[PDB]
Amino acid sequence: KAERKRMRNRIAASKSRKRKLERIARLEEKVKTLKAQNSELASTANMLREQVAQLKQK
């Protein structure tokens, strides 16, 4: 029937919306996680710049 198809499409449409939100969430967690690493990597670089300017003494 057309009633049955209309009902299968209602689930298809909600599944489509769902994985749109799922995609938004992965992307947002990805940038959250790259920001953390950015800061990790950038402070380390900083800690290593000081080790350089302190070893070039003597």
Partner DNA sequence: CGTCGATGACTCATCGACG
Partner DNA sequence: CGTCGATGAGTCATCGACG
Residues near DNA, by CB under 7 A: 2, 5-10, 12-17, 19
Question: What would you report as the CA-atom Rg of the chain, rounded to the nearest whole angstrom?
Answer: 25
Query: Whose CA is closest to 18, among 29, 28, 6, 10?
Result: 10
Nearest-approach distance from CB 40 to a copy of itself, in angstroms: 9
Closer CB to a copy of itself, 8 or 55, in the complex: 55
Asked if 13 is part of the footprint of a copy of itself (rule: CB under 8 A), the reply reads: no
Encoded amino acid at 55, one letter: L
CA 31 to chain centre: 4
Asked if 49 is part of the footprint of a copy of itself (rule: CB under 8 A), the reply reads: yes
